[PDB]
């Protein structure tokens, strides 16, 4: 070992322990690869607030625990996630991250209203707070890499009450669903860009109009069945629309299996027709800007916010709920 | 390759500036501490050699600068908290390439790998310091990484004066002259510890100005286009070049045992 040994009992006298500080024991909501998330409490009378604690995988820290925390600790914006506090357990070698609690996300939002739709001025204040999120992260040279609905947390009620909290950004390498993935990463592109989160966007933005996942697929480098989705919603591409296709590493395996012709009636106006939202509107217009097949020609996040669908009659809002009663079940907690 | 461009243009409300810029004089409160045993001329001496470490490891394992000058102020920053007596700065030195590596998204170094380029660098560039193999295995660096994280309150992005130096020069426009000579004194001032006191631009600043000094430019009407505080840019001249009569004077082959068996030992457990 070789340490000190009055620096080492000093700093283990000293230091501030998960399980000392927390009640979190039965509080299980989130359970995934990553590890476990409780909705804590302190243990003392200090402050009866909630709290999201993360307990990762694995002993040690990897690279992208290394990653998320590095970027966390110099992350600030509204529309971002913060972190509280991160405790380093000497004994099992486990590290926990404490975060702000956020009651909902889209994921169960959608999942409520597809159970049942959403205000239209709720989902242009979701959609403009997670485009204020995402520029904020370009802006810093930050990209997300995986923005899908359960990454994207609303605050319930609280100081903070209706407000987007983006989470798990700038760590992901690249069962598992890929509905939110931008096609050049389905034909072998091998790199995360600004363009791939601004897709996402797209894709989360059309589920925000409609509660179906506009590319939902079945579960199984280069995703067949899911292409074959993208293409039936939105076309197949011609090449004037996305002359560099040539370049991504699975084009030829793309004209082997798919045929032009077999998605000549397809295209992203007739699908949304189908789920009554008007092609003449400002709202189809900007998602059909995020929606576009290559990546170059997809809209940046600060250019998305500009666009005069938010400057369109209702504004949106800090409150995305808008004032009335969050309809929205609270987070259930979880056994096994 | 590339480098990280993480958090660019935000110093200004970063981990760095508000926690790990140090006033001067604080700095200096806590080597007292280490002054009992070592000269404030032998610990300036102690620091260039493990800067030289943290370069060799980091030149073997194939990193890249970037790496390194984060790899380094970690290494600084822990010891200008704690005594050189508390961890091995054997230990400390690939404990910090490890970690920045991974902080970066460069690598997972690997065990195997991170400890033979342990053992080389040590076996080879340095067995004038350190006679005998590299003692520790991957548990030792594990731990020590998990007191690393601890000290920092996992300030893990950091800067240095290379970026902002880029830019400097792209308006000059001698990237065929200036930049190369610059780019190793921005090098060489991690052998003092300027990255805890001064925020990095000016560190930039004050390289190039160097560099024009040596090559004999006329840089004379550019300094003076820059809201900025030149009694700072000047402190830091005098560092770098005095960092250079130091280097003049300093035999690290020939001095280095000596000072090490001067550090303060580890007490052992009862
Ligand atoms: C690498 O990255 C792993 C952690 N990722 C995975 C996605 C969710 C997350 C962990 C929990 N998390 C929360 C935070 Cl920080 C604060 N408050 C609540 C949540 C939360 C809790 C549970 C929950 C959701 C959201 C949606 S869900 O379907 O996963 N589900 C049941 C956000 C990030």
Redesign the interface.
């Given at each position: 070992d070789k340490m000190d040994y009055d620096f080492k009992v000093k700093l283990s006298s000293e230091r501030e322990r998960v399980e000392d500080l927390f009640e979190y024991e039965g509080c299980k909501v989130g359970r995934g690869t990553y590890g476990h998330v409780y909705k804590a409490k302190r243990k003392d009378g200090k402050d009866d607030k909630d709290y999201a604690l993360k307990q990762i995988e694995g002993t040690g820290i990897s690279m992208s625990a290394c990653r998320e925390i590095a970027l966390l600790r110099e992350l600030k914006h509204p529309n971002v996630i913060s972190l509280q506090k991160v405790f380093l357990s000497h004994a099992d070698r486990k590290v926990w991250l404490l975060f702000d609690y956020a009651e909902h996300d889209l994921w169960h939002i959608i999942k409520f209203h597809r159970a049942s739709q959403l205000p239209r001025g709720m989902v242009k204040s979701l959609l403009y707070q997670i485009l204020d999120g995402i520029h904020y992260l370009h802006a810093n040279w930050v990209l997300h890499r995986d923005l899908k609905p359960a990454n994207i947390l609303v605050m319930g009620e609280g100081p903070e009450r209706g407000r987007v909290k983006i989470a798990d950004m700038g760590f992901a390498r690249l069962v598992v669903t890929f509905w939110y993935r931008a096609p050049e990463l389905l034909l072998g592109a091998r790199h995360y860009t600004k363009a791939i989160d601004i897709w996402a966007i797209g894709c989360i933005f059309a589920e925000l109009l409609t509660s179906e996942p506009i590319f939902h697929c079945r579960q199984e480098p280069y995703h067949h069945d899911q292409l074959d989705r993208i293409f039936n919603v939105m076309g197949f591409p011609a090449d004037k629309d996305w002359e560099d296709i040539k370049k991504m590493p699975e084009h030829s395996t793309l004209m082997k299996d798919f045929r032009r012709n077999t998605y000549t009636n397809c295209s992203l106006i007739k699908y949304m027709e189908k789920h009554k939202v008007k092609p003449d509107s400002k709202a189809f217009h900007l998602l059909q800007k995020l929606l576009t097949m290559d990546p170059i020609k997809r809209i940046t996040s600060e250019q998305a916010m500009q666009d005069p669908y938010f400057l369109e009659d209702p504004l949106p809002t800090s409150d995305v709920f808008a004032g009335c009663q969050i309809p929205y079940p609270k987070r259930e907690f979880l056994t096994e | 390759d590339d480098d990280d461009?993480?958090?660019?243009?935000?110093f200004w409300?970063?981990?760095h500036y508000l926690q790990w810029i140090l006033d001067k004089q604080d700095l200096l409160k806590e080597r007292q501490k280490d002054l009992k045993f070592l000269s404030e001329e032998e610990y300036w001496k102690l620091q260039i050699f493990f800067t030289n470490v943290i370069q060799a490891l980091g030149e073997h394992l194939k990193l890249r600068q970037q790496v390194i000058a984060t790899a380094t102020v970690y290494f600084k920053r822990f010891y200008a908290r704690?005594?050189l007596?508390?961890?091995?700065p054997v230990?400390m030195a690939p404990t910090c390439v490890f970690?920045a590596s991974?902080?970066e998204?460069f690598?997972?170094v690997s065990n195997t790998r991170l400890i033979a380029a342990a053992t080389s660098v040590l076996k080879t560039r340095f067995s004038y310091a350190f006679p005998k193999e590299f003692?520790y295995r991957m548990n030792?660096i594990?731990?020590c990484?998990?007191?690393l994280?601890?000290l920092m309150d996992?300030?893990?992005?950091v800067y240095h004066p290379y970026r902002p130096l880029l830019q400097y020069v792209q308006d000059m426009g001698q990237e065929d002259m200036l930049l190369p000579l610059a780019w190793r004194i921005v090098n060489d001032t991690y052998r003092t510890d300027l990255c805890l006191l001064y925020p990095p631009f000016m560190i930039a600043l004050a390289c190039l100005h160097v560099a024009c000094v040596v090559q004999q430019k006329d840089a004379r009407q550019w300094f003076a286009e820059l809201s900025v505080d030149m009694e700072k840019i000047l402190e830091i001249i005098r560092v770098i070049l005095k960092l250079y009569e130091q280097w003049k004077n300093f035999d690290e082959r020939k001095e280095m045992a000596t000072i090490l068996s001067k550090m303060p030992k580890?007490?052992?457990?009862?």
């Amino acid at each position: 070992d070789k340490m000190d040994y009055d620096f080492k009992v000093k700093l283990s006298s000293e230091r501030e322990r998960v399980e000392d500080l927390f009640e979190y024991e039965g509080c299980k909501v989130g359970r995934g690869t990553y590890g476990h998330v409780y909705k804590a409490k302190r243990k003392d009378g200090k402050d009866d607030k909630d709290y999201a604690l993360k307990q990762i995988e694995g002993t040690g820290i990897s690279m992208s625990a290394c990653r998320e925390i590095a970027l966390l600790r110099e992350l600030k914006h509204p529309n971002v996630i913060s972190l509280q506090k991160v405790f380093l357990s000497h004994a099992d070698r486990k590290v926990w991250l404490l975060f702000d609690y956020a009651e909902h996300d889209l994921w169960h939002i959608i999942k409520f209203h597809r159970a049942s739709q959403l205000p239209r001025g709720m989902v242009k204040s979701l959609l403009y707070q997670i485009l204020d999120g995402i520029h904020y992260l370009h802006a810093n040279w930050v990209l997300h890499r995986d923005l899908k609905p359960a990454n994207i947390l609303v605050m319930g009620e609280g100081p903070e009450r209706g407000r987007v909290k983006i989470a798990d950004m700038g760590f992901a390498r690249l069962v598992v669903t890929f509905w939110y993935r931008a096609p050049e990463l389905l034909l072998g592109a091998r790199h995360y860009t600004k363009a791939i989160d601004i897709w996402a966007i797209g894709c989360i933005f059309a589920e925000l109009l409609t509660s179906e996942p506009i590319f939902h697929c079945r579960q199984e480098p280069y995703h067949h069945d899911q292409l074959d989705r993208i293409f039936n919603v939105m076309g197949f591409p011609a090449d004037k629309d996305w002359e560099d296709i040539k370049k991504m590493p699975e084009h030829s395996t793309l004209m082997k299996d798919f045929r032009r012709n077999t998605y000549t009636n397809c295209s992203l106006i007739k699908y949304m027709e189908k789920h009554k939202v008007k092609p003449d509107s400002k709202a189809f217009h900007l998602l059909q800007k995020l929606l576009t097949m290559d990546p170059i020609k997809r809209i940046t996040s600060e250019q998305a916010m500009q666009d005069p669908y938010f400057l369109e009659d209702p504004l949106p809002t800090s409150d995305v709920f808008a004032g009335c009663q969050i309809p929205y079940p609270k987070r259930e907690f979880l056994t096994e | 390759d590339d480098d990280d461009k993480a958090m660019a243009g935000n110093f200004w409300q970063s981990s760095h500036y508000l926690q790990w810029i140090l006033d001067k004089q604080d700095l200096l409160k806590e080597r007292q501490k280490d002054l009992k045993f070592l000269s404030e001329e032998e610990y300036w001496k102690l620091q260039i050699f493990f800067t030289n470490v943290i370069q060799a490891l980091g030149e073997h394992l194939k990193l890249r600068q970037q790496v390194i000058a984060t790899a380094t102020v970690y290494f600084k920053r822990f010891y200008a908290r704690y005594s050189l007596k508390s961890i091995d700065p054997v230990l400390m030195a690939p404990t910090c390439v490890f970690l920045a590596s991974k902080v970066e998204e460069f690598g997972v170094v690997s065990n195997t790998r991170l400890i033979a380029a342990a053992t080389s660098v040590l076996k080879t560039r340095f067995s004038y310091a350190f006679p005998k193999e590299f003692p520790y295995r991957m548990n030792h660096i594990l731990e020590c990484e998990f007191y690393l994280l601890e000290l920092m309150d996992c300030c893990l992005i950091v800067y240095h004066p290379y970026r902002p130096l880029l830019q400097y020069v792209q308006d000059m426009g001698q990237e065929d002259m200036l930049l190369p000579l610059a780019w190793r004194i921005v090098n060489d001032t991690y052998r003092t510890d300027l990255c805890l006191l001064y925020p990095p631009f000016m560190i930039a600043l004050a390289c190039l100005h160097v560099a024009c000094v040596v090559q004999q430019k006329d840089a004379r009407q550019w300094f003076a286009e820059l809201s900025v505080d030149m009694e700072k840019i000047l402190e830091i001249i005098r560092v770098i070049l005095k960092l250079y009569e130091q280097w003049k004077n300093f035999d690290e082959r020939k001095e280095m045992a000596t000072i090490l068996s001067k550090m303060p030992k580890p007490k052992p457990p009862p």
